[PDB]
Every structure is written in C-alpha cells, then in structure tokens.
Amino acid sequence: MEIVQEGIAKIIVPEIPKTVSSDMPVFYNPRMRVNRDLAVLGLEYLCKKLGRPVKVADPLSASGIRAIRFLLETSCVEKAYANDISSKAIEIMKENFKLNNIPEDRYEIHGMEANFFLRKEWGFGFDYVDLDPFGTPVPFIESVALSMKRGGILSLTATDTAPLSGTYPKTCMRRYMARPLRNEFKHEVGIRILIKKVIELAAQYDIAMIPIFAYSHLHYFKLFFVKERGVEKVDKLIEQFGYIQYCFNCMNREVVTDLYKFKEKCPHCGSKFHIGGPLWIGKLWDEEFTNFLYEEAQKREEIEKETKRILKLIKEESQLQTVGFYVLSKLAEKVKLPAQPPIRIAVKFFNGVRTHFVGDGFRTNLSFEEVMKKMEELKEKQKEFLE
Template sequence: MAVANNLVKIIKEGQAQLQVPKTVFYNPIQEFNRDLSVLVLRTYLKHNIWHHKREERHVTSRGGMRILDALSASGLRAIRYAKELGEERSKVKGIVANDLSKAAVELIQQNIELNNLADFVTCKNADANQTMFESSASFDERFHVIDLDPFGTGAQFFDTAVRSIGEAGLLMVTCTDTAVLCGNASESCFARYGSMSMRGEFCHDAALRIILRSLEQHANVYGRYIKPLLSLSVDFYVRLFVQVFTQQAETKLSASKVSQVYLCKECKTHELQPLGTYEIKEDSTQASSENLAVKYKFKTPDVQVGDKCRICDGRFTIFGPIWNGPIHDVKFLELLKQELEISEPKNEFGTFRRIQGLIQLCIEELDVPLFLSATTMASILRMRLPRFKDFMSALVNAGYKVSISHTNQYGLKTNAPNTVVWDVFRQMAEQFRSQQDQSHPGSKKVKLQQTILMERIMSKPRERSYDFTYNAAIETESQKLSLLRFQMNPDKDWGPKSKPTTKT
C-alpha cells in the first residue's frame, strides 16, 4: 500500500498499537485528551447515562449503540474505545472511524487489522458532516456517541452533530483555535461561533462558554438542548462533553442560559446581562405542571448593568454572548472519580495523575461564570499578590463561597458580588500599603493613568471590614491530597503541531 512506504514507527498508547506515518496527524501531547475520553465514555455507558425512554427501544432493537469517530486520522481514538471499554463494550454495536482523506482511511484500516478489530470497527471515507447527516435518516442508524476532534475549529460540524445524534447522546468536542476563542480575532470568533471573544485573564473560561452557547443555539433550531457534563480548557485546546436532548419546551429556557458580558476597560471587572428570564406562574395548577411552557412565564429582563463600572467608574466594552449556566455536572464528575479509582490498580491511563487532579479541581470549582483575577486586582492596587488563604478566608468568614478556576490558578470564582471582592482587596491594600509600596519593584515608575485608577478605586468607601482569620473551610481535597492540579508544559516545543500534509 502507498501508506506503508511512509511509515516511521509503531507507537503504543493505552491498549492500542498504531502505525504512524509522517503524513497523517498524530499528537502524543493529546494522550490526556484521549485517556479522559475513554474514561468519560466508559462511565457514560456503565452508569446508563445514555438511558432515555425515547431511545431505549431503538438501541435495544439494533443490538446496541453506535459510536462515531468523525475525524479519525489514524484511527487511534476508535481503536482505543474498542479495546478499553471493558464490559461496557457489550452495549455497543460498533464503531465507525471516518475520515475525508483516502490515505488516512487506508491507514485506519491497517491499524484496525493490526489490533484485530475488523469485526467491531469499520472505517469510512467521507465528509464528517455527510456521515452524520446520513445516519440521522433512521433511528436505528443514529450514532449515540459522536467524537469531534478536528484540527482547529469544530464549529462547521456543530449543526449536523446536534441534529443527528441520538436522544441523550454523548457529544465530545475538541477545538484547538484557542487564539480566536480567547480574543485574538473576535470577528473570526463571531463568524465561527456567533459570539465576540475578548482577551483577559478569564478568556479560557469564556472560550468554553462561547462554544457551549454555540452548541445550544444549533440544538435549539431542532427543538433540542444540551446538558454539559464536563468542560475543560487545557494545554492548547478545549475539550467538552455534553449530552443532547429533545424537548421543545426546554428550549424556551435557553435565553436565560445566555448572557452578554460587560467588561470594564480599566479595572477589568465584568458584569453579566442575561438575555432572557422566567418566573413560575402564580396560578397553583400551572405552577405544579411538568409542562415548562405552562409552568413558567418567560420575559425579557430589565437592564441590570449601569452605564459605568461600579468599581472604578470606568467605561464598559461588550462581548459575548456566552453560556452562563453550569459547565460541569458534579454528579457525573463524582462517577468519573469512582471509575478512575477503579482503574488505578490496572495502570490503564498514562495521564492518571493529571486526570485525577483535574476532575477533583472541577468538582471543587464553583458554578460561577468567569472570575476575577487576583493578579490583575493586585497589580491595579499596586500591591504584591497576597496569600490566597488570607483573602479566601476573608470571603468565607463573610458568608460567601470561593474557589479557584481550573483554567487559571489565580482566578477567583465566588458567589460574592464584585464590590465585596474589591472591598477585601482594598482592605488588604490599606493594611499593608506602606511596606508594599516600598518593596514593589518599579513602583515609582508607574504610569500616571495607573496611579489615578488605583486612587479612584481606593477612594471608594468600603461597605464593611473583613476578618482575615484563617478558615479551615478553604482547604480543598485536591490541596490536602497534593493532587496534580496545574501541570507545566509537558514537553519541549509542545502544541497543536502542524496540519497533516496528505492530500484528500
């Protein structure tokens, strides 16, 4: 075969063996992505999270569900799924490894045979959208799990994926165009995802929410909606796991799950403006109804954001809209944690420690859109970054919850109003102002504009004084167990690698 002449080596990942030529895309840095995907899929099948009364009959009648690796390249994902599902493989009828490149499909077939999976994994040479669309013609042919792992954006596959996937199906999405999603080209982000992105400390959190909003919007067109199970921004890409359901009435809630973001140009504080809202109807009969269209009264919300920032009186810039709902399902994360612990003695995952730490970090992460950056706030107030246990204890002592973000170790997620968080920092700046000003490197060279901003914020009166006494409630399990939470770059010159060079 033509591909065989280009083979460079056989690699092993998980339980799969793989022939890897130069011309077909393979990135070893994404082993974490693939390990996690195997764990998620296994958990999804084992705990019957796929189970839905509308779909059970079709899944049972066709002898199990179908899985699609839509952009398979080398076939690695499909092969790992086939070999590492364990007992849950009995719930799967088969896996399709699809790719548009003829050379890639030829290689996939070789790898399928190398792993003795010809009776379970089939390859297809077609456009991913075409493969998904054709499967939607029959309930028995629908894919119940679709994995989208493109080079760059996956936006061009969203519409067909959410339309064609089976009820309560698992959609796994990777996007590597994080530069666009994080504000380097907001106009390109809008063209792809329907949202304006923006630079800032929370840009990776926002990137996840931009994609979730886009998936929800595409699903709504077909009377469907999404439920995020796990959403991660790691390394150079984002990886999201969502379920897709059908219920026309539920789509009426979608506007309330989306917000426009107002970001202060000066102090970088954000405010959210929901695009929709709803309330339970006063009529007791209607209020107890399971029909959402009957139970709720939907309306457009009042404007909640003023014309200037409450922290520094600065002007706002607008971006979004973004998803403002949960990006993780904590119950599902607990199941993932259990399954990971079961796998530990078998040494199944090469990235076990990282998966363990990240899952626990996501469990601890508060369900709060975006975050305030401790480094940005300290810089604006011309103070050294305070100890996290001090300002986190102050917030907890005041009756609020606080956590860090899995996307940024200096990101403060809290249910406290922004004014309260800034009050805590102002009090710390007041208490330690003299010594911090003296030891701040280059503090005398701070620009006049920055000095004015600092003085404007410091001049605002605090609502109250805060207690910085250490509170043990801020200690998390990931800290107590010294889990790997934020990994350094895994290799020299790591990243998304170059596009495959094979002609289709």
C-alpha cells in the same frame, strides 16, 4: 513510520516533530492525551448509565486512536464507526485496528466527508460521538446533533481558541455571532461562546444539546454535551443565554440577561463597561458527570496522572460555579499587595475555590466590591502585622 502507545492502544503514526503545540495539526498528537482520556471516561459514564451495548461514532478519526481506545478501554461498545476523508488516513486506520486485534464485526471504517458519514441512513442513532477537528467544530455540529440518539453524549474539541478568546474579534463574530473578551478569564468567555453556538445550531431542529462539562487547556477547548428532545428543554437552554459586562481598568464584571440593563460606564471606576456575548451563562459542569469522571479516572492505570490531577481540580471548581473568575496576580498588581499567598491559601480569604483555567485564578460568590474590600482588608492586616 513510528509506533506509539496510548492507554491500552498501540498505533502506527507518522513521526512527529521534536516538540509540538497542544493543537499541532499532525496525524497523531500525543499532547491530546488528556483530551482522549476524558473522551474514554465520558464513554464509560454512558456505559454505566445505559447498561447496554452502545454504538459510537468517530467522524474525524485520523489514526483511529479514539475509536480504538473506546473499543479497548470501555465495557459497552457494540460497534465503533470510524471515518476520515483522507485516503492514507484510512490505510493507517485499517492497520491500527488490526494491530490491536479488534474483531472485524466490532467496527466499520468509512472514507467520507464527515457530514455525509454522520447523516447516512444508519437506521439507528449514535449513543456517543467524539468530534475532534483541527480548528472549529461548527461545520459538523448540526450533523452530529441530528445523528445522535436521544440521551447520547457528545465529546467535543475546538482548537480555534484564539478567535474565541478575543485575539481575533471580527473572526469570532463571523463564526460565532458573539463579541469576545480578551481579559484574565478570556478562555472561559470563549468556552461560553462556543457553548452558545452549539446550542443554537441544535436548537434549529428542536434538539436540546445540554452542556455537562468544560475543560480549557492551552490552545484547545474540550466540551461534553448530552442530547435531549422537547421544545421546552430547548427553551430552557436559550433562556440561559446572556452577556458579560467587563471593565478593563478595574476588572469589574457583571452578568446581563436583560437587554434594557446594559451600563455604558463601569459603576466602580467609571471606565468603559465592555460587553461580551451573547454566550452561555449557565453551568459549565454537571456535578454527577464530573464526579464520575474523577472517580473512574482514579481506577485506571492507563489514564494519565495529569488527567487525574486536572479532574480533581475541576471537581473542586464545579462546586462553586460562577460566570467569570478572578486572577490573584492581577488583583495584587491593582492594589499592590505586599506578598501573594499561595493560591490554595488565597482562595480561602475570598470564600472561593481554585479554577483549572489559570494557576492563580479563583471563583467566589462575593461581589466585585466585596472582593476588592477583601484585597484591602488583606494588605491592611499584612502591613499591620508586619510589625
């Protein structure tokens, strides 16, 4: 119905509405461009790390765009295995591979349910898997983990951000077995819950799925994991499950890994100290992986400018990783600050860094009390020097 270009790929896709959401359930959504850019960069990383030809899986392929961009824009793909349960998805996919002049022996197209596709007796494990569902990836996690080769990377998307972010808490509990927190850093809480779920499902088979990258945008989450083996590595991951206590009155927060250590009342203002989790309380970014993504992205003209800006922000963010973050406007509303300095400047007063999660958000190693003290010191010297 319509021809579009993304990166080096050209594809035929049904016409899409004048405007779409980031998680729009259409055959091809151009707003997922950043997502696919990241997936391509993540694969190139593996190309450079393994230094050999890899086999990649695209179990939920639709137009075939991801598999195609993998083949066209990375150096090491021996063969791409694309799949979709939808028959017309398949037809379109076929024509799209041909449209990009991709040799037949470079790919396989299948029309199976994704779990069956992944669990086929291939005789080999996948080095790279991109799992890109509408909604939750939960139903496919185990099959992906089992199908992947040791040291392989998973490119993952989830669009069920509403439950994970606290809009629908009972729904979140049913699917992820965790209590969410609908606060100023709700998207981070959501991502950490998702990570926990991925890890525990793989852990059932003594597979260690280590998170190495996180990205939140509007109504989707983007994660990367690397698969490893050994019960000790699984154990290490599990040890980094925990909870976040958070106060809606004053925004105080605290990480708890010791079940004996929960506090009913917020030590700051005495309001109810809510509990979020259990969830991943470890790092959201592997420094080296993240740095590579950024550097490699900059060498590619076919990578969106936005992806490059986001990666630069995430690089900065990855150097001061914390559980949760602060939002300047909300702190300001709390202490009535005369004027809010631009976030780039604001973070400096807190020895912090910007976060991609929210425009005026920031991470810091300072304690909550210290942060509030800084909010008072500022405002105090703002008012004093105001004459």
